[PDB]
Amino acid sequence: QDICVLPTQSWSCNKLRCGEKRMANVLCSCSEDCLTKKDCCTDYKSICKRETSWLKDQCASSQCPEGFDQSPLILFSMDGFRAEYLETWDTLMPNINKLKTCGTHAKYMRAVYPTKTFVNHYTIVTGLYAETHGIIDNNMYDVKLNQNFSLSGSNMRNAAWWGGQPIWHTASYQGLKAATYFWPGSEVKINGSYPTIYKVYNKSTPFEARVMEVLKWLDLPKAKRPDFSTLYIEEPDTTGHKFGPVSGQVIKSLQMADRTLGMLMEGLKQRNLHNCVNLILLADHGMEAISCNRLEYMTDYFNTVDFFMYEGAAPRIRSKNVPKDFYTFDSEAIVKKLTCRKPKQHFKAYLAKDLPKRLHFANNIRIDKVNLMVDRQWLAVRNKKCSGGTHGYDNEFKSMEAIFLAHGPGFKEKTEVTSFENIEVYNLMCDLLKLKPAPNNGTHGSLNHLLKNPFYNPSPAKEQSPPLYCLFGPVPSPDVSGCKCSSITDLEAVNQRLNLIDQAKMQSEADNLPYGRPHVLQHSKYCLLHQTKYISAYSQDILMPLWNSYTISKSLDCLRLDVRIPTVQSQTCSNYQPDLAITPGFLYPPDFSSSGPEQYDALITSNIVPMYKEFARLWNYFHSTLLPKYATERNGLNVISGPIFDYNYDGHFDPYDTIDQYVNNTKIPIPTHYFVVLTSCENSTKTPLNCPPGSLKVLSFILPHRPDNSESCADKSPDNLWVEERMQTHTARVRDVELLTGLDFYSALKQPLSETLRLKTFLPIFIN
Template sequence: MGLGKQSQKKTIIIGVLAVSIVTIVLGLGLGLGLKKDSCPPGPVVPHTSCRNRCYEPYDGDVPGCRCDANCEETNSCCFDFNDTCTLPSEQWECTRLRCGEKRLEKSNCHCSDDCLSAGDCCTNYKHVCHGERQWVEDECEDLSAPACPASFKRQPLLLVSLDGLRAEYLQKWSRVIPVLDRLKTCGTSTPYMQAAFPSKTFPNHYTIVTGLYPESNGLIDNVMYDPVFDASFSLSSPEKDNPDWYLGQPIWHTAQYQGLKSGTFFWPGSDVNVNGSFPNIYQPYDGKVPFEERVFTVLKWLQLPDNERPDFYTLYLEEPDKSGHSYGPDSGGLVQSIQGVDKIVGQLMNGLKQIGLHRCVNIIILADHGMEETSCQRKEVMQDLVGDINKYWVTEGPFGRIRARNKDTVIDPPGLVANMTCKKPDQKIKPYLKADLPKRLHFANSRRIEDVNVLVDLKWLFERSPGSLTFCAGGTHGYDNDAASMHAMFLSYGPKFHYKTEIEPFSNIELYNLMCDLLEISPTDNNGTHGSMNHLLRVPFHEPTFPPEQSSPDNCPLESLNPPAVSLGCSCPGMHENVTNSRLNLTAEEVSAAEKQHLLFGRPRVLQPDQAYCVLHQEGYITGYSHTALMPLWSSFTIDQPTNLDPLPPVMPDCLRADVRVPSSKTPTCDQYESAGNLTHAFLYPPNLNSTADEQFDALLLSNVVPMYPEFKKIWDYFHRSLLKKYASIYNGVNVVTGPVFDYNYDGRYDSPEQIQQFVSGTNISIPTHYFVVLTSCKDSVLPASACTGELQTVCFLLPHRASNMESCKSSQPEAQWVEDHMWFHQSRVRDVEWVTGLDFYQDSSRPIPELLKMKTRPTAAIQRQQ
């Protein structure tokens, strides 16, 4: 019993102790816990950066700098608040600080880790954040194998305009424009592209996208008046948005009509409802939109889904034109502006590389015109020349146009031109009736072109009255488009263009056809010559062919050696008629020899319908004689390099005879010219080029005669007498084709019989408006024209046939003082001659047609006068 009680007692003691221990432990734990809760917190690390904290709500319990929207008011922002939070909404590039940033809603572009998948990275994201090289740092690539995403059905075309970037800038400032210089090196470029006249912004931009000269595309200037609309157009007026001003079919419509899409980030006409529609995507013009935003937007368009993505794009930048106007073409401000656009083009190329399209997109970067220095001290004043100017409205500047001040005022355009011509020594302006302007300008065939136009010397300006032209210092454009300072830059790059290639200059009217070829669509009718730009392309899309002849020659056989029974009033003392006429009866071998010598590149084809003519062969020349016009359509002959430059001897006097191969009903009479009053006859082929009297007789024929004003004949005779041998010497022999031109409606195309307005008095013999000359020689001047197997070169003239030579202020002096200058001012392209005559040359030259078209369209600025 005693032991049991002791054991029970021990158990109770152990239980009490256990409970006590548990109680103590619980008490200590609870006590310690409460004590811990009552302790003050440890030190908190203060904020020192806005990295991933931009615009977080302000928390006053957190020490350090702030990143909320109001931190600037209290001057408590973190040091990097501006760089990290503010600048992304103002700038368009990544910095090292921004790499891996938290995406910000207001950023222009992003540098976050997800920006590539979102397609909205800044264009230098991979370069700055991943160490990849910029596009300009890469080696030139031969893009013979395009690398486009599988979803791209065709290679996109991007057309970029850098307004007013004179061609010369690319060479002069190449060291400070590395991106443009790289594109020039790696792609296809030209020393310059000739702008259309007038060398102004809207006319040339619209020419580029329509292939039409300003006289045909409707935009003859940045400022103009339409007498039918009785309205004026300017870049700041509501009329700018009136589609009735815009003619032709811009390429974005050509693309849309053939199932393609277009996106335009500014281009003259692209935000106007032309032809009843807009591009698929377009931006209404707003010059305040940053250049970077324009590039970024185009890059976004390139990443659209297949059913939304455009095939053709435009991008327009106002610089360096604005700086050129403000500071002049040779200024620090101008250099800064071209550095700025070079940076923008660099962003474009980096962006294309970043989205994997730099080996896919075909890019054309160009300008609309150049820039020339001006000064307020160099102005010609209309009022100083003509006195009273109250009835005139004058468009001032580098090119002038004059009309009546209002519809009720009548002015005398020919009288005004005469009153402004050669009024003082060293005059800096020259007035013209629009029909008399050089054909190379293609500036007449529009009701919006005033009757009186004023060409202005480079660096000078034309104003109505003293001080009326207020913007005169700095730079401007609009001068003669042959001037080097008006030339525009052109670069192209992409898989369809040649690699590291420089081509010869060309005119911007050829670009529309080229761009259609790049898009693989068919162009609508335009002023360009399709196929003339094939040499830019690795694989040409269009293969041109010769136009078919519309009127084939008839035969003009010599049926009798006797002159016609009907008297033609001709006489030629000292000539043995039968003997001389027998020289016109060439054998087949003699005909072949004459053609081999004088039709070096084939007989000109006649594209005029219903033209009755025959080909007359002589030993010294060959003529296409028109039974319809009663005069030669053309005359062709070849002059070898002469041994001396002595002028040709005088033409045998008092001799003009009938051509026994031509029926008397199809020839003029000699006395018709004798009674023509202010007209005389002249020879298309110079008889005095022949060395013997017999050979001269071969050319003293009515079939070699054309009507001429005596004053113009001074020009023609000097050309025959002195310049033909000079050019044959310079070019190592030349083939010469000459003939009359009829363009009374001054549209640059040959007239129909109904359109011809003036005739030799008392006859149905038409008076030409111009005479043409086409000189062809070998581009390799080591080879004579008669043995040329390579490329050809040409010099052409379209000489206005007028009763007065007052256009030249030196016309009272000997012809050697002024005729050649006058002729070169009226220089033209082969294509201009073909259009205005209805002839087509070189069809038998055995040369590739694209090569011939390149030669025919070679701009006049690229054909320099040689002494």
């Protein structure tokens, strides 16, 4: 009859099945001579030998069978499983919801740009930004190889495409075995090797069969058994693409996912591995709803479209004739004619070096230089001629956030953790495998709060240049600076306020550097300039401060030379002219001190940096009105700001012998960006200075130092209400500023180094 011929089509066990004896055509045995031969449905002991299912159990507290001396780690990926699915539909997914309940669960996991599967899947297993491992999109063109990249093409298995070191190679190079049941890269001969066991991708393999195979790798003899295995399924990405994120169709793809995870967990409890295996359940990206009333056509911006265009949520544009006009293609011209042509364009045009530095999406020959930052739910296509959902957007968008759930003896129990970025997962996986990670872009130790016994303890970065000294001196014999200050009558007296005694310097350090001065992790000849209201590290290598830090409380033409800075290591007033695009802007705004003698502490050559006049518009307005409002909102702020030189857009500080771009007829380098880090405290009944380091709140900006405000299309507005909106898409991690400057912040905080590392990896986000 029917319920003893479904054994050939069903991967579960019903009650009338147990004790059935061998048929040839059974996918899964439900015999009693079953276990001994290692081939039973996960629910066998749950429904027949009346044991309690894993899902019904209570979550026991802090193991493994005999041959398992180290906990195996399973990496489970459900493509396109956006974080909101778990927030809205966990009710419908009892097994996934148990993981959330008793394992370690993050609010969401940030993907990398572009938020596509091969990009993020390889990123997860290498811990590298897409710009570095090379898989920068599912479809790419490399000019050096003159080769196309595609999932349905064959060049996808050419190892020249795949950089870095995936986790499975890391596992094998240090004595463990790894088996991947589908993972982007696992079929490629990266570094001349495969995983210890891998599976040719066949999308038609049923999810249940994949779960059975992973559970049959764990039944192998100890000498052959893999220590790390991945498991991959295409839902809810496949159905999410066709029917959209809010759909009944996705709700039952999501229940199919819950079925398969539960299958895995039931089979694990059968083997007494359920409190042994370390399980990470994540996704590569999210899902966003699209429409055809939400298409942007390049024909509405060009008359002739003689360029190739990777379309969708993350578009790029290159020449149609490659490889011969690849370097010639006028990339800036396409960006400029896509710049503020209509008042309500649902995208913005960028060259790769102008992309928000937080994305880390330049510095790869495959990253074509024309790029489009498309608004959510819209797509950018070339022509006029779509439904359901897609992905690829900016990874700040709520629809792009991925789930991250962990379970096992190596993780904490029933713990909720803050958001983190998937680039952090590679390190965390080698910790659970007791492996030394290959170099990557995670901040090793920042995910330690997830682990029950952290395997790696971070140690502070060694300072690479201690400060020199710039002592107090007389005013030079002539004043060749070209600086003039009508207002000053007793020059000797006001210059004395820059000559504080040693304890007066301490008191200011206690006020303006409450977390310790930043350590310099490059080479830099610099001194420390103490004033009562601000402290700077002035570098003779770049004729300006490396950083300027000051502290403000909730509410709050004269320029001369710094007698501590030698003339040759100085900026002078005459370096800047009124028929030049660059004007001296201030790091510490003089308007913040009370005027009279305290204001003169900020009106010196040691407190100015070269600024495009239209950037100083943005810069001054932020300090003018925006910064004092954030101060009342957050109850005071510790501010630290300075220049960034990244002319080759690698995300790292430029060494000084690399800087070519000076201002006309001088030796003053033009920064590519300026950073601003604002530290307050979550519990705002406290100030930036009396806060437990564990409740610190950080907000950091890296502003593109650009000659126009084309990005905001605000070169002819009679206001500055546009500035806050553009600054809010140029936030960054403190870590991002550290990389771009060669500085190391927050060293003197009185808390474990791993806890500070969470603060530096935090990313401020404003898209609500």
